[PDB]
Amino acid sequence: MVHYKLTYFAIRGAGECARQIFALADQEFEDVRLDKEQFAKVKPDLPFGQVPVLEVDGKQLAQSLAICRYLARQFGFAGKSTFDEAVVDSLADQYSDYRVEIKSFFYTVIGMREGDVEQLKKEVLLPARDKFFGFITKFLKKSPSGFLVGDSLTWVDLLVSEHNATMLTFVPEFLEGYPEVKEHMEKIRAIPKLKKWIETRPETLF
Template identity: 35%
Template sequence: MPAYKLTYLNARGGAELIRLLFAADEIPYEDVRVDRDKWLELKPKTPMGQVPILEVDGHVICQSMTVVRFIAREAGLLGKTLLDQARADMLLEGGIDVGKLFEEMVMEKDASKKVEKKKEFGEKTLPPFLALYEGFAGDNGYFVGDSVADLFRHCVLQHDGFHHSRVP
């Protein structure tokens, strides 16, 4: 089995789904979490100036969703059929779209704009997104079943800022 080393900030963020994938298939890996100072030192040494990065036997892979799909493939969690895989991709990509809006809201520096963005996200963006995604869950409560999309649902929709009871 390859040696995996995941490097990310000392936060859940863009690496949490990757960590869940490792855990789901009990794949051993080194979880390197860096603070701001270490990140500023590391950034110029990364392939695209960002994290997460995954080292696989010395080869470096970056871009969150590339790493997610790489580990999901290794863990057998992309979906059993091509249609399952496409459905999982569709749900992941839709979540990324909403995640970008969430990140813009959180990162807003101007206090009055931040209040506006929170209101917009909490009232106009999140409710239709959650309703739409609830509709994708089957009778068994899963998006696909044994897939990265269902781990995504657990990771983001139930435990991070998207969950309706935790919108800032």
Template identity: 35%
Template sequence: MTYKLTYFNVTALAEPIRFLLSYLNTDFEDYRFDRELWPTIKPTMPFGKVPVLEIDGKTLNQSTAITRYLAKKAGLTGSDDWEALLIDIAVDNVHDFRQALAGYFYDANEESKKLKYEPLLKETIPFYMDKFESIVAENKGYFVNGKLTWADLFFVAVLDYLNYMAGIDLLDGRPQLQALKATVVAIPQIKAWIAKRPVTP
């Protein structure tokens, strides 16, 4: 099978896909483009959004669905339906947090953006990050059932993006999540990907 991933030249929502493809030891074309090209690329995308993954020439959208598909191939989706549900919940909770950060970060109105930052810093970020810390502590260093799943890879893959939007190190003072990150980035395939991937903001 041939794989081509199309996204902006950043980590963000494409990075979980890159992590999973790397975990699977799968060669893939990592096509990145600058934002100036987006107006010409957007009309060619299935729903006008990226990332998309082409598998043998068939273009697929929806990054979480793609990541889940690859996670099934990697055996990281859980041992039964209940475990798979818990993993999906963990990933969706991270998505909720990402959307809360994005509501601040992408606000084009500087006045309203400034007003959003203090509640974000004092309420939203502690609320989510402390819950994530507790969940990982309760599950022996992972998000679900004390073992590596795609929820762990997903969280670590989007962490740089979350930090960038928050403007702080979200793992500061959270040793359980720090340890989880260390575990994921030490996986040989992930470590190799991180070493060779382009350096981006």
């Protein structure tokens, strides 16, 4: 029996996607949530001095995309071919580039950096969202099954669902002219094992 240990801060952020995979796979795992004092003590012995970090039977593995992709492959949420897996990878990286775009706004709301909320919303967030959902909608209208790629759940379905669900907490008007994305968020998060995890995980904002 493989023993999985996930180490990240007491928040969903970039560690949640890995957590949702463990829930969907019905896989027991050690969910370590650290504070600023405790992270400082372990930081020097982490691959890149950063979290999330996955430990598979001792072996450390950093970087959320690499963690989620690895765990997706093991439990079969990566895609049903290497090309589909590549296309799934592409949506995940496009999502990452989209997070770089809205960093300015995202860190302001939660209060990790100083900024003006209202102009960053209309001038940075919504424009990035428009462009991003434009590509997302394009994948959904190409999909008969509902999922972002192929005819089954893949780990990027989790990434995108969780982000939109999270963003609705801060910006209620996020999915207005985009019913395909809203449908998608609902479809994914309606999955009992996922919903169960949503209902019983530590209520952190973001």
